[PDB]
Design a protein around this ligand. Structure first.
Ligand code: 2GP
Ligand code: CA
Ligand code: CA
Length: 104
């Protein structure tokens, strides 16, 4: 079973933790990768009801199981905060334009 389902993509908690750890490390070191400069602040324009505190940062989580290193980011993202807490997993899949919807 999937802990997070982003469209057709199936993710386990371990996938989210592995992705979050990579993005958090880059955040703490003040570095970014990719043309879109990940990780970067997530403003929560969508108004998701995150239970943890801000600031929030988005980082790509890949369907292949591989850790993002600068290529195409795909549609899915893990959102984490300043205290290394997972806020949520979201996706562009099933959403209009560049909006996000939450993964189930
Ligand atoms: N949809 C959305 N985009 C955000 C948010 N916070 C930052 N962004 C960025 O705002 C711009 C319009 O969506 C994009 O550059 C997007 O970054 P990403 O495209 O890297 O996600 C947010 O809360 N929602
Ligand atoms: Ca996996
Ligand atoms: Ca692999």
């Amino acid at each position: 079973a999937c802990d997070y389902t982003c469209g057709s993509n199936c993710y386990s908690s371990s996938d989210a933790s592995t992705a979050q750890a990579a993005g958090y490390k880059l955040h703490e070191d003040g570095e970014t990768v990719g043309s879109n400069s990940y990780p970067h602040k997530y403003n929560n324009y969508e108004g998701f009801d995150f239970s943890v505190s801000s600031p929030y940062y988005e980082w790509p989580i890949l369907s292949s199981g591989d850790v993002y290193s600068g290529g195409s980011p795909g549609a899915d993202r893990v959102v984490f905060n300043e205290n290394n807490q997972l806020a949520g997993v979201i996706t562009h899949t099933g959403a209009s334009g560049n909006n996000f919807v939450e993964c189930t």
